[PDB]
Amino acid sequence: MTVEPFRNEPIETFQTEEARRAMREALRRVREEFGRHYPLYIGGEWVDTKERMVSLNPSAPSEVVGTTAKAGKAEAEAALEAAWKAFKTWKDWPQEDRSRLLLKAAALMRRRKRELEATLVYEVGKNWVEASADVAEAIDFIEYYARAALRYRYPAVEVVPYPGEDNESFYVPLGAGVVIAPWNFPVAIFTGMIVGPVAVGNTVIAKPAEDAVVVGAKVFEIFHEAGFPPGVVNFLPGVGEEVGAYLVEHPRIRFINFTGSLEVGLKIYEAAGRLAPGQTWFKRAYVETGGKDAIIVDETADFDLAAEGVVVSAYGFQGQKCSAASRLILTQGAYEPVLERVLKRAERLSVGPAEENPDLGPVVSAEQERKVLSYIEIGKNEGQLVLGGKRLEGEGYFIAPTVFTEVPPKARIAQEEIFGPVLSVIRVKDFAEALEVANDTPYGLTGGVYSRKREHLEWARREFHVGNLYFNRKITGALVGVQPFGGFKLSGTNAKTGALDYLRLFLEMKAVAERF
Amino acid sequence: MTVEPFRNEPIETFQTEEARRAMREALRRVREEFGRHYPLYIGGEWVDTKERMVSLNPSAPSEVVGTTAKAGKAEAEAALEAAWKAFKTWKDWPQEDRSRLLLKAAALMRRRKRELEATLVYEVGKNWVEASADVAEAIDFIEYYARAALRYRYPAVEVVPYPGEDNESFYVPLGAGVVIAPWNFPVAIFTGMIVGPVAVGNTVIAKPAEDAVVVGAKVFEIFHEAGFPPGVVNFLPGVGEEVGAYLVEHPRIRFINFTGSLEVGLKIYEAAGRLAPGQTWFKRAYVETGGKDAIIVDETADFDLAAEGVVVSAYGFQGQKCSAASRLILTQGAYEPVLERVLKRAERLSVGPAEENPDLGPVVSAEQERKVLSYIEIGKNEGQLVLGGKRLEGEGYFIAPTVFTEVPPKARIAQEEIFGPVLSVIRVKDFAEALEVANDTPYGLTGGVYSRKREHLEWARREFHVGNLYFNRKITGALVGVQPFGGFKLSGTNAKTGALDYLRLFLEMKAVAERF
Amino acid sequence: MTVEPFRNEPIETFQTEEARRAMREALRRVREEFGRHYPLYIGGEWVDTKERMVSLNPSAPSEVVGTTAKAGKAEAEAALEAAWKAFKTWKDWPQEDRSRLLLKAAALMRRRKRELEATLVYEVGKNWVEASADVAEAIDFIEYYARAALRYRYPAVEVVPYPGEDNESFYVPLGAGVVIAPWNFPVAIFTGMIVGPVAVGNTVIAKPAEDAVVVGAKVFEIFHEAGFPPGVVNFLPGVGEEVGAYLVEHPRIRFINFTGSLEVGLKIYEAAGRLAPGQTWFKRAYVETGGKDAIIVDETADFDLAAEGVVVSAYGFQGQKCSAASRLILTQGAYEPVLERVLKRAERLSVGPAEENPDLGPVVSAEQERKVLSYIEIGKNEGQLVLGGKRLEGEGYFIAPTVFTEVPPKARIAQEEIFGPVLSVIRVKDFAEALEVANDTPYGLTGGVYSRKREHLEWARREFHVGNLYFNRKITGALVGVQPFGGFKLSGTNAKTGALDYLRLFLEMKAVAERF
Ligand SMILES: N[C@@H](CCC(=O)O)C(=O)O
């Protein structure tokens, strides 16, 4: 190696005066720039369009936080042509050179941490620590993939030798692909999904989520200053499915990297399986599609520790995480003790404008608000509402931490991803039943168990079927490198982010033999 | 390691009297066994059916090599139930135990080599050496995957540590899947596609190609004797698309491993991308779909060496290989010298009943013969026929080595996979044009270059876009371990067989963290 | 690895106000619990007995610090049955699972550091830093052995392969054994001797030293909360040799791990060599039996540095360490300079109630006091008393730092382990004579040399025959992992604690071959 061993970027807690001062300064600079317009980024240059998109502050929706250009099919085609033109030479860059470019981008992002965090606060309603964790994770993806990519450098394949011949196998990138990013981790996942494929020689066209187009543009300002060659990375904010559908079904799109709802993920995977007219390859599609994550607590657990972890997991970033604890499975002996503690802690959570660093900011949009409130109405017919369950005062999309108890395992609110601050509590007889209920959903992303019994923990290690399992701690916040992130079943294709294996997904192998 | 380092099984040449004596006895016993009936193999037992399938000797179509039971939807469902039941416990076997089971199977197959080779000679028309190479490769897949699987044993993932926590990532098998095997390497590929997934904990339902059901049954006799637990491997010969379609589209089939025509591969990949009613995962589909492989020869090459390699590559097993040289691209200076040599060598090739160990046996079936002859008629109006181009006398499906020259690069015979003894010769101006023509097809499986110019070879290493490239030697016969086999573009998904990476395709990763 | 690399637990120096406050709080909690009764721990549960044992405060012997149950032969037999029953399943736990259990125990012990330290202060008279070092070392043993155990996981043996066979050699634990722990490091050594064997699959019956039964019980509270399966670890405090003799001579005790006096160690080793009626194995007995450790100082040394190290080594924990410097060998040129400095430093050492953090607390018991005073009387007839040599005022067993000079190398006080604050100074002609005198004792545990002459240091590295040798620093305080601890000659069997080799002592090897 030529750089220090990988270490995760520390997550700012803002416990010091300097940290709080720096954040206030960043928040001021960001809001003073709410009037800024961000164009598309195609072929190494910012390209504007006639029509525009408006980004709103979910904590005060009448306030615009910025506007961006709006890509259509014409711009998507232009981006694809630029991406393929760039691929022709970018694929030949020595890996050491590509990795150094990523390291430069990480250094630039680290120097703009507060600015990006403040943008997350105002654009998507993350409180201070959620915002800091998001940006820190983006930096981690860049630092991690830059190093991981070197493990695949020419010629990396272990082969069996043969007399009188040189047999060399090596990896090569696929080509130009499309990245469809989420609004809940618009810096972290947006960055990771792009730089992973790019690190090993691919080129990318990235479509940010509508609710997070401004922060996505700021990430591209970093890519631009870093110096990625024209066409290697492209930015196409857009409205509706136009751009995404056009690229996903395009005969010249080589791969698709997607993180979002199961509904969209299913359509993408189906489309990727089809041979578009003139297509000359089998498309690769990687999808991360959510979950219905549960935390199991049995009677041997430290009930206070469990309650704290459950509240953090269920309500962090208003429960808008694919990893959020949306189900709390309690064995009979743990039911009353844990539920009472969870309710006591949850009722003390503050909800308000994200910039004030409340425990919960607003949900991301009017549409998300409508969806969450709709599920709350559904829940009233399936379980017992014991906490919250309503919209709070203010134009901002503030929803109170919600808890439903005595929820049937097969109830809609115990099966479908609400993606809001709504926790469903399920009572079970014993640990075996807890595991059965935990596994009985179409998903398999995150899960947790609070217990002191070794046999129960190791039992879960073998049978709680989720891609990311945690014992006696929160089930959210997977760290790059430490906890490869990705699930089973309808949670996706198990493309483990923040792991060496992730980069292999964007490479193909060639074997060349020379008989002397 | 607890066994000797992997070494490829020697391919018998039958030059010694001992080898000839052994082969003659094996051929005699297999012939004397003609007419035998082989049932299906489901849940550890041989299960017969009312209806049956007939396997004919392509060298003498009136002769029935044997008959097998015929599986329908009911048998497929029974096999799927057995495979999932078995998966529950097979996935928990220590890897060392599963690997030892594979090694036992390899030892048993090795002891039945001559018998399996003789069965290939009679059932699919392979001459002696082609049959020996097939069986040797099957043994190699078992020996190689047995060892490779241990590289993924619990807990194999390299992760970054975190203070006060144990973070453990490991691989687990996917579940029960279906294997759809080809008739051209009915022992080798049939075995490889089954044992790879099985080695790491998956269970399989295998559908042999209709023309090679008998040898597939013999491979299962070996699996049974080795002791694979009931349900781990299942044998379902069948007629038509019924069985394959039912399993490929089944909501409970976890993965599909396919090797065959592009037409079928495209349908499988599309079906795999769809969520069948009640399906709870994104199906994985691995497909190897053929090629239109070329050998380029420039004016600096050893023309005699090139001509020999071209003839072996084009006519070995009657050109019925996805790796076969079906295109010969000659630069202006190499055209006359190489073509004259290729014609002289090809016109001396013997064609006759496979048991006689001719240079070429018959094509595999009446339908295949019809298709190859149809392509020859098409070729007569596209290029210039200069050798062969007709069916030979006899009941067997004998076709003479055929050569067309001055073939336009975009002609149907220069673009579509004929899978017969038909070589298309294309004349180009220089090496640059040779590479352009070589790359201009929808495929990308194998390719070769005969040249003494270092700059041309290294240029091809970087730009001749095929998964398996060979310099100054034949382009067929990839050896397990030595030459990871798999292509680009419409040649498939690049699932490299005989390589460490192959097994990763049948595993998913779990990350478990415990905060102490 | 799945956890951070091993690091030694920091030893608290109590230089901060918070540290001192935390210690005072811990001391208060511990003394408020002096009335507590601690039962035996057998088969996963606390089991009380009719008779009890009383633990006294050596700094105020009329004060009881706690009482415990008293095990007899019946309880020892019950513990052995529980240990064997547990072994049957504990031996089959994946090593990763056993190691995680140890890591949990370490985390629990770390959270109770101050409590354990305060218990050591009151029960065995350790001052603050000696107490902190003791607990920190116990944590180190758990953390170290948890990691070291993974190095022996299935199948760990490097063997030579053979054609057509799988040859696998692996380690397995021995069974149920007995641990006989010392009173001088009742948390550290008590813990290490137990968790080392347990980590790799053995089960243990532990007999704490009579003077330290309370702190031993607190360590078992940690084992209990950690969740070791019933029978894996058992606690049997007792009076006299009854329990120890019964287990050591038992036909069903598989191994014996002992740390204590040579007198007892010799008896244990002799008994272990005998085949008890019905015994079906050769018992393994590991014994650490003390020393008569010397520090050599020559004329080239930094005399002030040497004096400081000698005083720390001779009087730390009142010289009650098997590693304590009980002999000071000075060459002629170093004699006066070093002796004067040692006397000046030693005369400034404070002696008093351990809780007040004096340089020296009291010796551990009335019996130890009697022994040390007896050796002082013996010393008066062999050497010249120049410092201390008497009991101080108070009911506590306070003995003043003592120094005898002009001591003959073969004098009883220069040969026998006093285990008290008594240093014997021997004058020698040169370095060669210093080494001769250093080696001329029945022991060989620790030793030290203060010198700037490279040739003398390297000479000692090769010829100062002790298991743990230190240059220009104290000879006590061996750190887990850094300095494998164990001696030569009558200091024991050289079972190096805190080293990878330690765990091998509790394993046996099996070699299994399968001919395919
Ligand atoms: N990796 C994030 C979840 C990302 C997502 O919500 O998609 C976590 O572990 O909290």
Ligand SMILES: N[C@@H](CCC(=O)O)C(=O)O
């Ligand atoms: N691996 C074989 C080709 C297998 C196939 O035809 O599918 C070869 O290299 O000749």
Ligand SMILES: N[C@@H](CCC(=O)O)C(=O)O
């Ligand atoms: N390991 C301790 C000595 C333990 C004992 O006295 O038995 C030290 O080096 O000081």
